[PDB]
Design a protein around this ligand. Sequence first.
Ligand SMILES: [Cl-]
Ligand SMILES: [Cl-]
Ligand SMILES: [Cl-]
Ligand SMILES: [Mg+2]
Ligand SMILES: [Mg+2]
Ligand SMILES: [Mg+2]
Ligand SMILES: [Mg+2]
Lengths: 244, 232, 241, 222, 204, 250, 241, 196, 196
Amino acid sequence: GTGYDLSNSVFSPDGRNFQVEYAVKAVENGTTSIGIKCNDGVVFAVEKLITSKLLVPQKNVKIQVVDRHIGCVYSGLIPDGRHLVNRGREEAASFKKLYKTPIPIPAFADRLGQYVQAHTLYNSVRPFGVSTIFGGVDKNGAHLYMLEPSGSYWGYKGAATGKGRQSAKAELEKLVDHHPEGLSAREAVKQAAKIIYLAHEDNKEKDFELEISWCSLSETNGLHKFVKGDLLQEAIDFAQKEIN
Amino acid sequence: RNNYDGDTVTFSPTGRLFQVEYALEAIKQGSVTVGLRSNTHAVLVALKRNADELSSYQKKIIKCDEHMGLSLAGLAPDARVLSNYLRQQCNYSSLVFNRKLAVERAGHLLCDKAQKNTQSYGGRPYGVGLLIIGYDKSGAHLLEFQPSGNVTELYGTAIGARSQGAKTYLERTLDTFIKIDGNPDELIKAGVEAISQSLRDESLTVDNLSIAIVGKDTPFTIYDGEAVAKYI
Amino acid sequence: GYDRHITIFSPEGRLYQVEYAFKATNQTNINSLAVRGKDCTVVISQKKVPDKLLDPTTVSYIFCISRTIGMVVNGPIPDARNAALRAKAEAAEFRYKYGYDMPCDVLAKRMANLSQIYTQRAYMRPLGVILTFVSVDEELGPSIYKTDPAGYYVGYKATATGPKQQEITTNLENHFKKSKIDHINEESWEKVVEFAITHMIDALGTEFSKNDLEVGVATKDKFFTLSAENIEERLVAIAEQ
Amino acid sequence: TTIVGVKFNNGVVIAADTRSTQGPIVADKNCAKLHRISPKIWCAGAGTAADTEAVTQLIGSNIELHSLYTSREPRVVSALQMLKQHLFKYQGHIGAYLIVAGVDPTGSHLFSIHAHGSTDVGYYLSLGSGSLAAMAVLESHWKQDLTKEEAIKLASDAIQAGIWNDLGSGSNVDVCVMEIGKDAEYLRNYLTPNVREEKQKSYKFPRGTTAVLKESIVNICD
Amino acid sequence: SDPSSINGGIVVAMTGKDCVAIACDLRLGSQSLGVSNKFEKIFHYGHVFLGITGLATDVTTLNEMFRYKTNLYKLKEERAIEPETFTQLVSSSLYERRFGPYFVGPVVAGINSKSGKPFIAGFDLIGCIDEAKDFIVSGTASDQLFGMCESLYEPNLEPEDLFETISQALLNAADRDALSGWGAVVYIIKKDEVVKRYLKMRQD
Amino acid sequence: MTDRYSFSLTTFSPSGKLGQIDYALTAVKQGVTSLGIKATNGVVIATEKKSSSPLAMSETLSKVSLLTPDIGAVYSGMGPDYRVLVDKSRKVAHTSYKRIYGEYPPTKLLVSEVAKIMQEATQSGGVRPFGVSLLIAGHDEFNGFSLYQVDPSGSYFPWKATAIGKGSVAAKTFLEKRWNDELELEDAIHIALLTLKESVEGEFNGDTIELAIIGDENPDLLGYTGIPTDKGPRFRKLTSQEINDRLEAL
Amino acid sequence: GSRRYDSRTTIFSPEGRLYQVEYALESISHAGTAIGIMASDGIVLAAERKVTSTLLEQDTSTEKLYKLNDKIAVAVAGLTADAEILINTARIHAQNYLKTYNEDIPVEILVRRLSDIKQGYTQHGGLRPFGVSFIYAGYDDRYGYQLYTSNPSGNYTGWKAISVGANTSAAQTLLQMDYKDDMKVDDAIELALKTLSKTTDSSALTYDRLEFATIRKDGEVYQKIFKPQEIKDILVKTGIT
Amino acid sequence: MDIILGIRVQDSVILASSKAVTRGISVLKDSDDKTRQLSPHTLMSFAGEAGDTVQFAEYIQANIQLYSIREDYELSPQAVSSFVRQELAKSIRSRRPYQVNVLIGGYDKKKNKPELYQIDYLGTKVELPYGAHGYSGFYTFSLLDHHYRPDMTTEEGLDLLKLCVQELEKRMPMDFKGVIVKIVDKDGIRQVDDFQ
Amino acid sequence: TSIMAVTFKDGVILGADSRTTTGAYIANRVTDKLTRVHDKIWCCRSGSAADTQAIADIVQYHLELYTSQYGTPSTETAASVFKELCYENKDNLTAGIIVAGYDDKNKGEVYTIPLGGSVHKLPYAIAGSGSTFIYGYCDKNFRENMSKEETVDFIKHSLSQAIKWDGSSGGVIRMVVLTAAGVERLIFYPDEYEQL
Ligand SMILES: [Cl-]
Ligand SMILES: [Cl-]
Ligand SMILES: [Cl-]
Ligand SMILES: [Mg+2]
Ligand SMILES: [Mg+2]
Ligand SMILES: [Mg+2]
Ligand SMILES: [Mg+2]
């Protein structure tokens, strides 16, 4: 038969949930965004298309914090991302209120995962139109995670999603070769700027603005902070040099 | 579009949300309105629309607090709903925290209110666009609200029918009007020029022009009618 | 929409959504099989990590439900973790309310009953997964109980699940027909794990590296999963006949 | 009331008296204070009489359904958890004070529960107004590793101490024995030391003694 | 004010050979004031008889209720309810209101249409079932009825004799209770027939 | 995120048919054969434990199910539906009867109660009918032995014998020939095994057959002694051995 | 969301008919015929069982005639399981009226409420109608012997004799011929059996396919539901066997 | 302690009800009709806590009137008194129970028998030949116990009632400002206008 | 009741008396006031037996579920769950709990939660009706980083004093030793600890 892609929680005869796969299309049309895991933290970076010189620079921030130790970035329908993040904040508060310890990164992944999976269960809601990269430092390491509209998520060495995902993945697979003994928080910031710049060539149409954040046991004491100011410029430079 | 546009809970096979897209079409039929800001003030200019020669001119600007206000283009009722929710948040911030609500944060709250009505069955997206201005602890601010939920901070912009005229003009005049500091009459003049690039067979009158300004030491004030003669 | 979209009968008397749910269980292209020792229970499942960017340690379809119950899922990870959380909860609640540890079979029945519901109430879709539960029950001894999207559950001498389910089942049938018993008469669980990996290999016609497999063992005391290093040890022994 | 439970080498026995009282009036001279929760889990109740049989039947009902669902023999700890969480939910307003005992696939068990929902473990327990007289006996004769025949007698003597020395108890001795391998054997009026002596007279009346005003037949068949 | 001591009254039932009898006074008062001498306290549902003492508004309600319940019972089971069963019905009905109970003290009496066995039972206001084989007392004169019953009674009385004994028990108890009297009624019940006699007694 | 299906999923067609009930019956017809037989001093119900893998352990799954100490159920159709109905049935016999009257429900009334649950799946919002027929057999003091059939529509009817599922027409006709109103219990057990014998294709033995009886009371199965008036239970499932032992006398 | 699958069960056709009521009536027209005849001294209920097999037990069977009350009974035509729902709510309502007023419920007030319930499923709630029609035979201290009829729409009307279910145009035509206002109970009994024997879709009319009940006049009113044997007898007496 | 008296003679039922309304220290009204007509042949009188008294009454009234029009039929007196008892018995276990007592007198046009009913705020209901609520029974029951005959004429009843009222005027501390008398018979409800 | 918990070099030890009273009657003379909520997280119960048992039972639930999902919980996490239950429910609970646990990073940790729901982390804590009598002794004898044998002796002497002066405490002395080696139970009988 036909018809299997108009409601949400519906199995197609070849076992798929087309509405989730259609949600991925919104993700793929989004901006490219990545995550790199290093020896004691994670870095997050994202491409901010300068639609028009009318946008205030530096001022439409995209990376969001959860609690004090978790960073989240996403590609796709931005307002869905904020929603998921809001839920994440509540979920991180509940956990801390009862257990006192701030929510461990894998435990947070499953909180998000379970919620997003929930929106593939009923035809009275649509799936999340965002893939989300997030992570942080907890009582025993750094953890990077990526989460699809299906609710699928896994832990990564590095991750990418958006229009430039393929350049990013390719450039990240490279990163696991040179620098395999480990990648330090600082080098990972630089490499992040490189990859965003390289991935931007599939969006060369518009000019863009780089935004990086990190969460390093050694460089941020384990708290999630934005790479701004001088260190930011150094990584922007390292991108220009290594692209020419 | 054929089979996939009957509600806000259905994605297109390419990833689109038609119900949200059709909502934007409502804005495009709305009347033009413009916002721009310097480092010290932020200005709204709107072209008010009438129905007959015998009718009033539908109001377009709504104060939200002493430091924040907006202009609307599209379904005026939805602006009532959204601007009224914005008044409540401004007021909550004041009462509970003795803190004026940051323009950036009002923007976040608006996005989230609208996004509820793109994952909810039985609801609909908002059919209106909003230009939000204010002066808070980090200065002048202009936001553009879209029914998708997307709220953006800009130096200037315009929404409504034929808005491209002003939008294009502001893109030229950018480096000039950012610098209009400590001279509000000159920022309004700038805005009234920007909005003119969007008229077609009509010129600005006392009856259809509507202007709001806010900024350092200037609480959000609205000028209509004889007050706006100064600027024509 | 049709009797094809929601969980209602077709004139044949069929629930197509339960059938298409079953199809999605194979969507991972992963096989699993479980066998009973004298006093242990082993499950084996393939591990396919194709992306160099993935953290292999976080890729698993074997879950520790309670101290005593392990659960291996055949099907997409989101539904599988959904099922896993719910069972971890059901097992903790059982303990609070009733004062002993929830038996493997009871949990299977309880999750099967939940499955039945999504088969009858229209607003919930089935979960595209098949649940394989293992324990060494304090009353029943080593146990294997399985659940599918139809709400079916049953207990198995041994079992296997996935795209080559049939070959593994027929393989294991023959070995028990030859041995004339319903279990691996071996007192070490390490040897039983080897039996499992062996008869697995012989039916898929493929050799395994220490990263192709994922192993879980259930004893009287607890249910634990093996490391890639504990697995390499098993494979080595298999390589020496 | 006087109720006790006594563990022996391969089981557990419980006993109770048979007197029920409203204030100082004996309402039933032969109440039955031992309750079945499952075939092999029996339970002796003291306190508000309606509250004990109400709460033992509720849990028992639920324990039965639990037993069918799990295809397993019921466990004492499951009666114990289900009772105490119920009594606790009711903040003490269900005046049930129980001694619960039984054998299940994990062994023999002896617990007590108080109306507010706290529980004890022990080898000998007593509850009720005769609590203290029975316990004087228990503390004076219990030893580890009693035999079924010693344990029955010890339990039965403890109820006796209550019957004679407590005004709140009690006419006969009910005993119930739960041995590990066997069925529960429930000995109603295991002991009947209070037979009323024959009255001094028959007060049968001459027929016609009572003055009657009206008489008529009543219809029952519809 | 103790709701059990507002309207007053008593009921008593006892067993003989292949028979049961149940009796009650007829007084209904408000505190000291006698108000009615026609307040019967013994009801029947088929061949099962139920007497109620206590707050009179609750007696009425409980009677109206057990009619309602037994009526539906006959419709669904296609038999009449038996005394043993009905006792369970009364018991659970009472306890359903454990924390706001009806201020009543019911007595059930009947012969089992199938087994032939005579049956009597009484309850407290929240359902505890005293199922004595000999006699059951209820009301503001229960203490007196306990003393009259414990002597006047011997097992297996013939109906004619059971009548004399229960009547003398009821009458003499009510005559020492300021809240019972003003008339009496005695039901003698055999497997086939039921006779109802009104007794003559002091009217003060 | 909530049951937004407040409306019936079973509706009348212009022909007057209730489609979804009919289809549920279809599913019952596909089910493995089951049957029940009433005798003068007992009742018997049997079905085929046709495993769906030789690696499955047939005994871990009872198609014959004790409802009360005096009532058993077997079915044909979708097991998962039957299973949640056995659970619901056991609970109702407590909540709506035992906790009220201190007795277990009599067979007709419990059947009536199950019937009501199935009727409701025929009319309530957002649910499909059940895909099973039930044969319930039991004994109460005032009605004796009895056998009832319950269909997905919620209808029930009492039988001297009948069969449902795959080989029902064959077995129904077979039973009409061999049934009299003077059969003893052991006799019906025989006729039961023979009728099932026709409907079964693979192995036919005490490990592939499930069969239970409502008969005399087994005080050896009570668990406790000392209450002389507690009799029961009248339900009893036959052992694997007890089935083979009677199969030679076939 | 789910509004895709809602068959609107409480909507009007462009002609002003209620789809599901009409279809529900079509359902009922294939149901065993039941007849109600009011005599000057009684009322008769007779109906035909469509379910008949040798092995069906009839001593313990009811399918069409149900006791509501000591003074009211119904003949059912349609989904017997729908009927039982409606019966118990009616059986209760009767007991509620008795409790409140210490009088038996007048026949019309019970019929009115039962039709009021049906009517509801016709106007709100989005459920399907009850596939049931009722013949009410009752007696009350104000209108005496009464005969009523209700259907899925919730409309009710009163009758001297009436029929519901299969072949009613046939049966109703026969009742119009032979019915006289001055009949006694035994006449109506025979008019009733003789109408069924002429409209049966079956070969001959036998006792094992009938239910039968009469409410007639001691100064009170008895209600009698014939047993299989009593029916067999009445069938010979009138010469149909 | 208002006066609510009732007597059922052979052909009718008579209700007498004190005329005074006292709020604390002053007598606010002396012409109060503590009666509501429940239907053409059923009359209910009442006394008790303020406001509760009429509210309950008018509620029962509108309820019986609704039944009359819906069934085009007049409920028997027995059934009205049963509906009323049920209503009071519900209130007694509710949050704020009605603090009301009632006498109900009606002529049963079907049995052609008059009937008198006494029901207290607790839902205690009794059928009586004569009855009173509150303290009124304490002075008058000895008179009524004596002179009452079941076959009295309406005129004999009125006389016996007059005696009761005078005993109430002699021995009762409160000035209750006399009674209003109403008769319910085969022909309905009339108010005796000349009671001196 | 007398309960304490003390950290030492190798971990932590919980100890308690075994007497629970109803009035002055000793209802149970061997109660086990040392309660397990997780493998190496225990507590000491004081207050309502009903209340403390209900709390422990619930905490044990929350920690089992936690373990299912996130692995072994910290001793601090166990103290938070107790404190949460006790503070949010302070109006209906009489519970005073000592939470004691072990891990390899922190070795032994002790948290006391008195009536009201506050939490206090300490090297050792005492509590129960008998604690008041040993505030002086314990303060003069506790030392950080004692040995196992020293610690058992410290606990043994302390409680013996508490048991001596407090009629509400008595019986045997129970201890539980939580170290990296596992879980050891200790019992000491009157004929021993009284002679101390
Ligand atoms: Cl999980
Ligand atoms: Cl009204
Ligand atoms: Cl009052
Ligand atoms: Mg369960
Ligand atoms: Mg009722
Ligand atoms: Mg009513
Ligand atoms: Mg609590």
